Design a protein around this ligand. Structure first.
Ligand SMILES: *[C@@H]1O[C@H](CO)[C@@H](O)[C@H](O)[C@H]1NC(C)=O
Ligand SMILES: *[C@@H]1O[C@H](CO)[C@@H](O)[C@H](O)[C@H]1NC(C)=O
Ligand SMILES: *[C@@H]1O[C@H](CO)[C@@H](O)[C@H](O)[C@H]1NC(C)=O
Ligand SMILES: *[C@@H]1O[C@H](CO)[C@@H](O)[C@H](O)[C@H]1NC(C)=O
Lengths: 233, 93, 213, 235, 51, 51, 213
């Protein structure tokens, strides 16, 4: 296992600073190099910076050359990245990744081998740079008519007005996974994202089972477990 | 106080050729000439077609033991020295 | 300082066929070109590095080839779970750059299972009632969704939310949220989301009355 | 009729067995790895193969000049594992050693850069001309043997001259990185210390371990000790 | 086709190695002339100034 | 004729390039041995004399 | 620090035939490889230098050749006075090394004439009596000599002395001296020299009693 986990991140206003950690665990003895790679929501990947064993880097992309500074703490096996003077386009999911070179390069083990590809990618930490941390209002979705369609019914929950992403949603504390459809967030014209999660289960369980969507929004620490029952009519 | 400066040195290194020195010792070197072989032709990635018992022209004509090679594509046809021709004696100008 | 351009932006390939991707690169690059498979909602995964050479324990159907400037990536036997996006990085100018990205699609034309959802009482009491119209499981992604309130089309208050292609049945799911006020909702009686699909003989429309399920 | 197509396909005479592995290069002796720029197994090759040369070995220097025991120093430091170029000091506290990371990295980058220049992707040749012949055919065969043998002897010179120049430049660039490092700290303490003539600086002022580290990381302010060191030099 | 293909690939290396060597030496000789200029003025001030 | 004329013209470039590089390095290395000797005696005098 | 290996250690070549010698050299060496002809009891004499250029006023029958690693030396018309040992040097890395040496032999299995010799009375009175056994005129040089004292086999007390081949009859001679003390000699009775040769049908053994000629 060469697992590494990214901690930190969140909502910042433009012009602020942010430090993101990266706990390098597992096979990496940390005489090998490491890099940071961000990807903006819906946009392509982009290499941010790199660091070698000890201080052989330096090496920062021109987009963040003067703004970001990468740090390495081998005594605790943690990679850092201080993101100063953040701008709007810095909103991205910053991935921490190990860098590997062909064995012909990398003469002295500690120093930088200028020809690296990233093999082990991290889980990533989402950093949003904007101007407000609202809690989502959860509204359930009840089936109408007569068993929605007939042999299978549909129901869901509405996660309206919140900032920022993401929002975790599960059904019956994770026991219901089959037929669940979690839709991506859509930024309303007001400026607050909206999400909807629906599940299609047969109509035979319309009354014998009580379905609960377990929405979790850690950025604003709002965790609502709304009850979904058919419309009373 | 004294501050000495120097470079690293290996207990035993490799000898290389230069413009002036034919045998000069360095700390590390790499071989650029591939002299060792596995001895076996890897069937991938190129679609290797083992000729086995016939040549390519023998399979082109249709020798009895080479009916399997019909409509067979190949990135590299490998003729064996153990090849032979069993059908009617022919010659190709 | 060394731009990468992938072609095309998105390609549609039937499952089983070989999908050839392009990664054209300004300047010369040979010793490094890594290919990645970033599935939606996940981190990128290394497929090929330095061109040609593939990563550890990845399927043999992922083939890499390229000399300089021009580079290609072909997926031999395509699977429904390959709906990921593909990127290409390189060396060096000390500064690695990534590609723009190549979205891969799969493919039968499935018809949308339309479902309507009236606003809940809790949302009605808030002051803004939003009606939801679901299109579960359908291919392709193109779906013309229209909202008709009291035999009149409504535009400017509906937003389209499309999910990524599924990893098994390879079908999309669409949801439209018709945001309206508390009095603007009660102002009208019948709500019907008009749905027209590529593989739809007649426009299927699901509706409901106000004050009745 | 046969369907006519034109592609990468070719033919080759070989008795090597077929194995379920991967290899871009294929020879009559067997598949060989094309990670090296040149090869000596066989002149007949298919696919992405290294260039055939007469030489059996051509070492390319990936390190520096090695001097273990008896230019400026009598010998190199075998105790250095943290870098290529480093410092040593005999101060009031004791005796220590540390490497200069920037000079080591700068020397590795130059070697890593040319290392890529030498191993850049080799030629991809498929259907060429036959170089081995079963019997004498006369004028046409004599030319085919001449065309190839010319290509081999010319490539052998191109390869053997390459390793000579690259390694000559390798020793020059690594030895100059130390001349620049000795010149770096030589400018650090102008007239605060003097070159002893063997690679060591005689610092005439009281310099502790942290003072030595200030010289190492490039924060040594000579004006602090200039009033002290100058007095110890001429008195 | 092989004679011409061989001729091209050998000249391509002859040219690629040429520009690689000459550009390296061009950068080398220009940097040396700067050192030779800095060393020229350095000798003019035996102990009248310091680097 | 083409194969031989190719071999000649390619060897002529190999020879002409060889004598130019080897002579340049020859003049380069001889000047360094002169500088090394100047630096050798320069280390002996230290501050007892000046260049 | 650049080892040289000549092959073989000694070669037999009839007079007039061409004798090819080998001088395998680790690591490359081209510009210098000198061949020498050192006759027994004399100083070496230069034959060839560089690789093929022969020395001044030496016969044309001496030929030299070789690439970087492999070198050869062929004597065209061989003469009876060419029984010398040949060496090959090289260059350089500041240190010149010589070869091991190649003895040149020229051109019936002879039976060893075994002769025993009891210790003399002058040697008996000294305190250490050594018995000597002679193998006069025999070919080849290989001769397994064993000492059997009071029938008991004795090892660790014997020394084998072999001559060079004769210039006329071309037969070697061997002598073994079994050194023992004064009391160790009188301790046993009969001393037998178990001699076994290549061209010997049965092991010829000559013995004598103590106290009787
Ligand atoms: C020599 O260099 C190679 C890189 O080409 C490196 O992997 C190896 O560790 C080095 N070994 C020594 C002894 O310097
Ligand atoms: C290097 O190896 C050789 C062995 O022959 C010998 O010189 C010594 O044991 C080692 N070390 C040095 C410094 O030579
Ligand atoms: C390769 O095979 C050829 C015969 O085709 C032989 O002459 C040569 O010595 C072989 N080389 C190696 C390295 O096996
Ligand atoms: C350099 O080292 C000294 C001594 O430890 C320390 O006080 C100083 O902060 C260091 N400066 C830098 C830039 O590392």
């Amino acid at each position: 296992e060469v697992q590494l986990l990214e901690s930190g991140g969140g909502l910042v206003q433009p012009g602020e600073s942010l430090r993101v950690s990266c706990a390098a665990s597992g096979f990496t003895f940390r005489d090998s190099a490491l890099s940071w790679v961000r990807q903006a929501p819906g946009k392509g990947l982009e290499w941010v910076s790199a660091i070698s064993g000890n201080g052989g880097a330096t090496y920062y992309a021109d987009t963040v050359k003067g703004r970001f500074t990468i740090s390495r703490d081998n005594s605790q096996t943690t990679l850092y990245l201080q993101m100063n003077s953040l701008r709007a386009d810095d909103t991205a999911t910053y991935y921490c990744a190990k860098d590997e070179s062909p064995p012909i390069y990398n003469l002295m083990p500690g120093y930088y081998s200028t020809y690296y590809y990233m093999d082990v990618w991290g889980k990533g930490t989402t950093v949003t740079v904007s101007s407000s941390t609202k809690g989502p209002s959860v509204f359930p979705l009840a089936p109408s008519s007569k068993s929605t369609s007939g042999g299978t019914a549909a129901l869901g929950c509405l996660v309206k007005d919140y900032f920022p992403e993401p929002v975790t949603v599960s059904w019956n504390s994770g026991a219901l996974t089959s037929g669940v459809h979690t839709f991506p967030a859509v930024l309303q014209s007001s400026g607050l994202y909206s999400l909807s999660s629906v599940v299609t289960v047969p109509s035979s369980s319309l009354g014998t089972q009580t379905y609960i969507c377990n929405v979790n929004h850690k950025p604003s620490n709002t965790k609502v477990d709304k009850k979904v029952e058919p419309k009373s009519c | 106080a004294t501050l000495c400066l120097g470079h690293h040195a290996v207990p035993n290194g490799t000898l290389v050729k230069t413009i002036t020195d034919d045998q000069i010792e360095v700390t590390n070197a790499t071989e650029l000439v591939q002299s060792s072989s596995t001895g076996k032709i890897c069937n991938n990635p190129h679609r290797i077609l083992d000729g086995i018992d016939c040549t390519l022209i023998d399979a082109l004509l249709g020798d009895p033991h080479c009916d399997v090679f019909q409509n067979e594509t190949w990135d590299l046809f490998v003729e064996r020295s153990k090849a032979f021709s069993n059908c009617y004696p022919y010659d190709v100008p | 300082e060394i731009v990468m351009t992938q072609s095309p932006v998105t390609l549609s390939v039937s499952p089983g066929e070989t999908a050839t991707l392009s990664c054209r690169a300004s300047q010369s690059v040979r010793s490094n070109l890594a290919w990645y498979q970033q599935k939606p909602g996940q981190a990128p995964r290394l497929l090929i590095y330095g061109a040609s050479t593939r990563a550890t324990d990845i399927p043999a159907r992922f083939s890499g080839s390229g000399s300089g400037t021009e580079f290609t990536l072909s997926i031999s036997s395509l699977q429904s779970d390959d709906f990921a996006v593909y990127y290409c990085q390189q060396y060096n100018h000390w500064l690695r750059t990534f590609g723009q990205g190549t979205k891969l699609e799969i493919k039968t034309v499935a018809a949308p299972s339309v479902f309507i959802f009236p606003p809940s009482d809790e949302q009605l009491k808030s002051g803004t009632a939003s009606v939801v119209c679901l299109l579960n499981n359908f291919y392709p992604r193109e779906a013309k969704v229209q909202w008709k309130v009291d035999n009149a089309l409504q535009s400017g208050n509906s937003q389209e939310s499309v999910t990524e292609q599924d990893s098994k049945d390879s079908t999309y799911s669409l949801s439209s949220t018709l945001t309206l006020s508390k009095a603007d909702y009660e102002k009208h009686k019948v709500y019907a989301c008009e749905v027209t699909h590529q593989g739809l003989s007649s426009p299927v429309t699901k509706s409901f009355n106000r004050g009745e399920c | 009729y046969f369907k006519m197509r034109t592609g990468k396909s070719s033919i080759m005479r070989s008795d090597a067995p077929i194995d379920t592995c991967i290899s871009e290069c294929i020879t009559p002796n067997g598949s060989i790895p094309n990670d090296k720029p040149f090869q000596n197994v066989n002149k007949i090759t298919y696919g992405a193969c290294p260039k055939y040369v007469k030489q059996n070995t051509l070492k390319l220097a990936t390190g520096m000049r090695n001097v273990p025991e008896k230019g400026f120093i009598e010998n190199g430091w075998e105790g250095m594992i943290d870098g290529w170029y480093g410092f040593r000091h005999q101060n009031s506290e004791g005796t220590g050693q540390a490497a200069d990371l920037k000079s080591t990295q700068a020397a590795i980058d130059q070697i890593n850069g040319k290392l890529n220049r030498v191993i850049e992707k080799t030629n991809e040749k498929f259907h060429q001309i036959e170089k081995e012949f079963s019997e004498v055919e006369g004028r046409i065969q004599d030319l085919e043997k001449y065309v190839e043998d010319t290509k081999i002897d010319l490539w052998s010179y191109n390869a053997e001259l390459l390793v000579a120049l690259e390694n000559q430049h390798t020793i020059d660039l690594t030895d100059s990185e130390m001349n620049k490092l000795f010149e770096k700290t030589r400018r650090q303490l102008r007239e605060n210390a003097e070159d002893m003539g063997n690679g060591c600086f005689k610092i005439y002022h009281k310099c502790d371990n942290a003072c030595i580290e200030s010289i190492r990381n490039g924060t040594y302010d000579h004006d602090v000790y200039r009033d002290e060191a100058l007095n110890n030099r001429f008195q």
